[model samples]
Every structure is written in structure tokens, then in C-alpha cells.
Target: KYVKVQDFYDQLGKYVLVAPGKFSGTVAATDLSTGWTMAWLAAWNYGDTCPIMHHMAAFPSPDPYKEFEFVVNTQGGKNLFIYGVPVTVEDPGEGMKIYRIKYDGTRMNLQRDAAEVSGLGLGVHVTITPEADGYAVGDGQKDICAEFDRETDMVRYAWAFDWDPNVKDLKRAWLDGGTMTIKRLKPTLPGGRYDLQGSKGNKIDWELVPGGELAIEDGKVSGDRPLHSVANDALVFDPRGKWAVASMRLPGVCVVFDRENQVPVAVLAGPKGTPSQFQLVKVDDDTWTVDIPEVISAGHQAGFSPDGQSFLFMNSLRQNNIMVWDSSNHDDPTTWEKKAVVESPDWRGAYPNTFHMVFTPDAKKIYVTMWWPSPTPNGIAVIDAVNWEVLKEVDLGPDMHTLAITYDGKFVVGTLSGYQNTASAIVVMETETDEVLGFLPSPMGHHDNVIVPRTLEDLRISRSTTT
Candidate 1:
């Protein structure tokens, strides 16, 4: 029941070998022009046609039942190993068994013997074998493939394929794990001539960008673009992985994007006390109107509560207030409201701008990075998550820019924004004991930092976007 190669002409890159020999997996140099080097199983392979499962589950074809599609890695590996798709092992003489696999926008499933399979249960067990010690892409030697040997009823990387041609181009190639976006910083002028200045005419020691976006796959950059053509800062995902809130620095507003479709779900505007100019008027669900005044307002950093009930957006501009939004509505931005505005303590110096925030495991406390403008040192402030009050403020060091909590929420980590020779270091604090451990120096300047999500559960909990 093999489909013709011409059927998948537009997506030929996904298929490793279009027509493979019955016995030999060897391919010629001319095969490089197609997909021989990049794919795993041959056209005659007995495994499932679908490669990765979840990716297809996330972004499926128009009609997955009729369309033969190859799944690519989108999110970092969440059961992302290359397991064979639904294939007939020993279909009884049930008049040619039919399996229906398709993604219905929200979820995907495989029909096994006219019944739906549950959670990676139907896929064939296949092992991904790396050709080289290091799974480096485009090196020619580090190619990897999935294989299944019938003699032992085992599956692993193919021993037949010599090299992968689609190493540099992986638009549709099956990957072992996920994809990430590197925050490309907007370059600054040398000798500090045109550096960012604070309200008091003092130089702001931080990397407040105009940053760009770089798409990374397999630890390598594959694409680049500006993040909305302005000083784009934060992109925080909901803890449940439903929606993502992105800050448009120059626009002075936050845009809510649908995580699945990448479409604009809603737009949020100011916690402005009196409403000077910018006001978010929802023209419709997707459309919005803001009084530009031919000019107007924004600095932003955001974090979701551990339970994903509320979202805290920190504004680093003049007011330096943390806007609390009622995210209980989730995707319905119209129902969302400005629950409260948590103001920073009166340090009474320069702009004690709030940069980043991270919640405790219990969601009881939130540690926010307060960037020191001048005179006073930058520090970390512990906020009462439920009450929305500043519990305690402590000077971690100079120019504290980013905040991240340990897996157990036992420790909170803050990174220094050492732009003008301030303090290029990371501060670790013990939450249970409430003690400052020590400041570890890092090379060059420091800004945004993240604790790597080691497991799938951690990825769901942390939702650390800055990969």
C-alpha cells in the first residue's frame, strides 16, 4: 500500500530515500540531490511512513487521513524520539485493516483496528543511533537514523545510510528533539557614545533591546528576523502551554498569541493610572485599536504563576509597576482584566526598574529582579503572590536583570546586568533559609538567564522560553 513519490512532490525532503533497493540501503551521490542522505527507512521499509509522532500531532496536514505527511520537531523533545508510526504488524484477515491518523487542530490520534491508540502506545519501538559520538549537524559524519531489525524484533538507527544530505536544511527532516529561538541582541555602538540613559541622565546598565529573533534547530541557527521591528523583550508562555504573551517594547503593549496557530489572539494595553494616551480598545477578537497620538509608550518582563491562574507583567518604565492580569480566562483576552498593579518599594533614588520575575513552587512567593538605576544597588524583591505585596527587598548586587528559580523552588537565581563595567555575575539565594549564598562572576556582560528544563515535566512547569 505504498503511495507514489509524485504524491509528496512538494515534501520530498522529508522522505529519506524515495526508492530504496530491497536488500541494499546504499545510495549514490546523485541521491544527495533528493533525500537519500537525510532520511532513515527506505521506500521499501516495513515501518510506519510517519516519523516523529507529536509534531504531527501539533501541526497536522489539511486532511491527515488522506495526506501522507512527515512530522518535524517543533517543541523540545517531549517523547520526541523517532518511533515508527502506525504500521500493520499482523493484521488479521479483517478485510485489509485501515488505520486513521490525523490531527484535529487540538489533538491527534491513531486509529488501530478501527480504534484510537492511546499515548505513544501504537508506535513501533525504534532506537535512534548516532553515526558519530557527537550528534552535530552538517558535519557529514554525525548523521543519525532510526532502524528496526526483524531478526531480533529490535529497532535502532539505520546501518545502511552512510551520510545525511539534509543536515543544513531540516525544514521537514525528522529530529531527535525540539526547536528553539535565540534572542539576538541589537548591537550597540562602541566607546559607549549612544548608550541607553535612565530618567536621571545616568547610563542604564542593561541590554534593553531592539533585539532580533533567531530560529535554532539541533543547537544551530536556521532562521533570523526582527521581533516585531521594535525593542522586543519578553515572551512568556502559560504554565499549561496554552498561550504565550510577548512584549512589544516600543509599542507599549503586550500581544497575546495563540500557541498552536501562532495567530494573534488578543492585545493588552497599559495599566496607565489615568489613561493618558494608549488604551487597548478591542475592535474584535483579533483586531485592536490603540490611540497612537502619533507617538506614545513601554519596558516589559513577564512570568506566569506556578498554577497558571494569574500572569504578572513587570513594566520597567517610569512607574515601575507589576501589572497583574486575571489569566483565569486563558485564551479569552476579552474576559481578562487588570486585576491589580503591584508597585515597587520606594528606594527613592533613580529608576529601580523591575526587570524579571519567577514564582515559587508553591506559588506563594515571586522573586523579582529590580535593576539599579544609580546610587542604590540593584537587588531582588520577594513578593507575596496571593496578596500582591512586596514581602521583602534585598540588595543582591548591582544591576540585577533576570530571575530564575531552582527546580525545587529552594533557591532563586538572579543575573547581573553588567553593561557599564558594573557586575557581570549571577546571584544565588536560598529560599527556605532566606540567605544570600554568593555571587559567581561570569564572562563579559550578563542579562537574561534560564535554568534548563531537564525533563518533560520540568518543561511543562518552567516553560522557560529563552532557549
Candidate 2:
């Protein structure tokens, strides 16, 4: 017999009611008066914080009789619950109705009433529910994935792409796994005078000649042409797979090599006045020439294409804009073609002209660094290589120069040197995402340019990766 109790209060004047209890296994019940039965299966414990029992039961009785029988099975430990009535298994076929109840301990006194009827030959039966929905049966497998290194062993050597005596070259050493290896390329031009003005000053004054152009000749002037310093524009390749090309305000040209092989190559941008002299030369294997009708004065930098058959070179020309010369014709000098020219707006000082250009990994776009007046801010621009159009311009605020794209095309690292001779370390930025990664303290002075190599073990990558 089931009876409803209202206002059942405890010693603290709090109403006592049966909350909710989760059944562990299966639960099936039937009502004798309505001849209706319902069964539910518990798959898993359902609760916010703790695990609660759940089960499934069904009406397995035949005729439209007003009574039904329910069965439950427990798979694990004994499950407990509180209800208003005493549940017992009498005659298996006789329909028994058991209400799914919870103990709130506020308004229900089933436990108290049962205690009073303890010796009346009344006993309760509990059964575990079978497995159902919303349950984690067993451990499952996870997918296998690979992750790339956040940082790599890459060396960067910064030098003037063109011959410029005013700028200082920097060789930074970074180690990927082993210790950094260093070598020295003795300066070439023993001694010569740097003629800032075509006037007479010091007789034996030595000046670093920019790369590419030959020594100036003025017989009556009584001053020798500045000697091309091996430390200056002359490209240097170390035994450790590192090569550096330098430019010191002279004709645009690049010195290149595979850092691992130590073989050096000179890539000359067409002389300013000479339009037909641009070529790519291999010191060891083949001397390839990139010939275009227009002259290339200051060949700032050159990058190899992924295919290795072709390469892209940037000419720092003030007038005809930035030209990309394709080096497909190795044997025939005249087989080269001017693929595209990065056009700049006519805004006088706004777009100071695109000079240095580095291609992204996919070769779809280019990152170009602009030159401006000292003490003024420098600008970094992105250009679409497909259409040869400007995509966006990122003003570096102030005191920044020299931009180099990483080998994988993930980051663009740049250097900044203030007017007061204080140099700030290079800043790494995500190329595709355009997010600033972080900054590293660099040596004092302006860097000519930054070079990222193709492989981590390459000397060029090692030189840049070294601290």
C-alpha cells in the first residue's frame, strides 16, 4: 500500500521529501488497475558530478490484463534506492506495480514506515539494470597524429645584397642540434681609396668596394678605386653549408652556394647602365646568364624556385620598379624573360619604391621591404606574384629594416637599427597569419639583409640559427 504524506518536517523544521535516486541496472514496472506496463534500460550513469545508476525494463506480459510483471538484472555491485512502498517478489506471474521513486529526505517517511513494519515478514528485492544508452562501455582507440617542431636549427647571415661600404654585414650563428661552426673568408681588396667625393684627401685611404661593379678608373685623379672587400659585397661560403651574398650600394648582385658543398656562385644583376649584362654564374658547374633588355642596376637578392630549374632575382632599381627575372635559359643568355615588375603608386614618399623582395613558399606572393630616410619608419609590403599587385602595406612603425622570409615560408624575420646607433634584434612574424611571434636581441648596427636557407642542416641555416 502506498500513501502520500505532506508537510513531513525534521527537527530543524525542514520538510522531508524523497529526492531522486538513479537505478543501476534494469527497471520494469506494471500497474494493476490500468493494465499498463513500462520498462526502461540504463546504459550509463547519468548525473552532473557523480555517477548514478540507470536501467532498462519492458512490459513482457501478454493479455490486456490490468497487471504486469517486471524483471531486473545487476551486472556489478548491489544498487540501492529509497521508495514509498515495500517491493517484493511474490507470485512471478502476478502483476506487480512498483513506482520509480527518489529519497529527498524532506517530505517522505518510507524508511521510517518500513522500520516499523520490519518484523511483519515484508522484504525488498533490488535488481541491477542491463546496459542501455548514454553509457561508456569500454576504452576506445584514438587517432594517430604527427606534430612539427615549433623551432628549428637554422642559421641566418645578414649582409648587403649589393656592394655598399656604408652598411655593416652580420653573421649570426644558431645551432639546430650540434655546436655552431664558424669560418672566415679573408677580405679580398688588399687596400684602396674610397672616393666619397671625386676630391683628394688621404692618399692610401682604404675603402670597401661594393660588389658587382669593377674598380673606377680616373687616371688624373691620383686616387685608386676602392678595393672590393671580401668582407663587403664579395660572397662568402663556409665549409659548414653557409653562403652569404653582399651588396654595398653598388650594382645589384648576389653570391650564392649550397652551404654543405662550400662551392660559391656569383649572380650578377645587370649593371645600371648596361642592360644586357644580367646573368647567373655557377663557379663550379655551369655559368648561366639571365639576359633581359632592361638594365638591372642593384640586384639586391635572389631566391631559388622550388623546382630548382628556375630562380627569382630582385633588382633595386629606382626608376623602372622591381623586376623579376626568370632564369630558365641557363645556356642561352638571351633566353631569360622579365616575368613581372612590382609597380608602386606615384605617391612621392608614401611608396618609396619596392626594392627588396622575398617570395613566399608557394611563390604566390612576395614580401618586400622598403627604404626610407633615416630616423623615419620603414615599411614592409606584401605583393601578389600572380597579378603583380600590392596586397597590403605594413608600416613597421619606426626603426626597422631588412626583411627575410623563412625557408618554409612560415615566418618573416626583420632587423631594426635606430638612428642613434642602437640596434634592435630581429622580429619574427607569421607570413600567412601576419602575427608577431617574438623578438631576439641582435648585435648593434644595421644589417644588410637576412637569408633563410632551404634545409636545417645547411650552413646558411646553421649560421642564422646560431645565437
Task: State the lDDT of candidate 2 residue by residue for 306-416, as single tens digits.
Answer: 322334444443343554556555443244455555566622343353434555656676676665545455667777777877777766634554555545566666655
TM-scores for candidates 1 onward, in order: 0.48, 0.39
Q: Scored by CA lDDT, what does every candidate get? A: 0.38, 0.31
> Candidate 1, residues 208-280: lDDT per residue as tens digits?
3211111211223211211112233444556566565555443445656554553445556544552322344
RMSD of each: 23.1, 33.9
Off by over 4 Å in 1: 1-230, 274-297, 347-350, 420-422, 460-467
lDDT of 2 at 318: 37
The number of the candidate with the highest TM-score is 1
Worst 10 residues of 1 by lDDT: 132-141
Q: lDDT, candidate 1, residue 351?
A: 62
The candidate scoring highest on lDDT is 1
Error of 1 at 452 (Å): 2.0
